[PDB]
């Protein structure tokens, strides 16, 4: 049980940190590239998403 | 292997539709590209879009 | 007849080949500074590898 608690916490943290790579249906998963490759009027939708 | 400046590539003839996909049309100067192609062909009036 | 010119390119993160004229900047180390190494706008401390 003591190891199980730590394993669950580590799994949750790892899932949360690895979630960042998800594009969420956008051009790219990095903010700087999206903000640099498009104007604000069309980039607002992607940023909000 | 060349330097592309869009300042020369500005309005030469009256440009009816200068539409760009995925890149802000006024930001092509700052961004750095990779393996750009070039095309040329002529279509009828009503089939432009 | 309409002269149709379509541009195609593939950006991803491949090494830069052509783009346009951008002034170069010298190299500094051990400071929390901005950097734009081949379109990679970001901050941090530049340290040897």
Burial of A1 (0-12, 13-18, 19+ CB in 10 A): exposed
**A39 to B26: CB separation less than 8 angstroms, yes or no:** yes
C3-8 contact pairs (CB < 8 A, 24+) = C3/B40, C3/B42, C4/B39, C4/B40, C4/B41, C4/B42, C4/B43, C4/B48, C5/B38, C5/B39, C5/B40, C6/B39, C7/B36, C7/B37, C7/B38, C7/B39, C8/B36, C8/B37, C8/B39
Q: What's the distance, CA B32 to chain centroid? A: 15
Closest CA to C8 of B4, B20, A19: B20
**B31 to A36: CB separation less than 8 angstroms, yes or no:** yes
Q: Which of residues 1-40 of A touch C (CB under 8 A)?
A: 32-33, 36
Distance in Å, alpha carbon of C41 to nearest chain A alpha carbon: 7
Nearest 5°: the CA angle A36, C7, B45 is 125
Report DSSP state, residue B46. T
B32 contacts C16 by C-beta, under 8 angstroms: yes
Contacts of residue B3, Cβ cutoff 8 Å, sequence gap at least 6:
C18, C19, C20, C21
> How many other C-beta atoms are found inside a 10 Å radius of the C-beta of residue B33?
19
A46 contacts A30 by C-beta, under 8 angstroms: no
Alpha-carbon distance of B31 to A33, in angstroms, equals 10
Give the number of residues written for chain B.
Answer: 49
Q: Write b or e for each residue in A3-34: b if 16 or more Cβ atoms lie within 10 A of its Cβ, otherwise e.
A: eeeeeeeeeeeeeeeeeeeeeeeeeeebeebb
CA atoms within 13 A on the CB side of C9: 20
**B24 to A27: CB separation less than 8 angstroms, yes or no:** no
* DSSP codes, C1-49: -EEE-------TTPPP-S-----------SSEEEE-TTS--EEEE----
Residues in C closer than 8 angstroms to A36, CB to CB, are 39, 41
Chains A–C, number of C-beta pairs less than 8 Å apart = 5
Distance in Å, alpha carbon of A32 to nearest chain C alpha carbon: 7
Question: Tokens 């040897």 sit at which residue?
Answer: C48
β-bridge partners, A29:
none
Q: Which two tokens stand for residue C16?
A: 């830069």
């Amino acid at each position: 049980k003591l190891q199980d608690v730590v394993n669950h916490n580590a799994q949750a943290l790892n899932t949360l940190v690895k979630q960042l790579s998800s594009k969420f249906g956008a051009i790219s998963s990095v903010l700087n590239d999206i903000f640099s490759r498009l104007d604000p009027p069309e980039a607002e939708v992607q940023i909000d998403r | 292997n060349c330097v592309a400046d869009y300042s020369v590539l500005y309005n030469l003839a009256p440009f009816f539709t200068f539409k760009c996909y995925g890149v802000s049309p006024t930001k092509l100067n700052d961004l750095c590209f990779t393996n750009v192609y070039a095309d040329s062909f002529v279509i009828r009036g009503d089939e432009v879009r | 007849p309409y002269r149709v010119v379509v541009l195609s390119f593939e950006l991803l993160h491949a090494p830069a080949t052509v783009c346009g004229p951008k002034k170069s900047t010298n190299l500094v180390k051990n400071k929390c500074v901005n950097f734009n190494f081949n379109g990679l706008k970001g901050t941090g401390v530049l340290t040897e590898s």
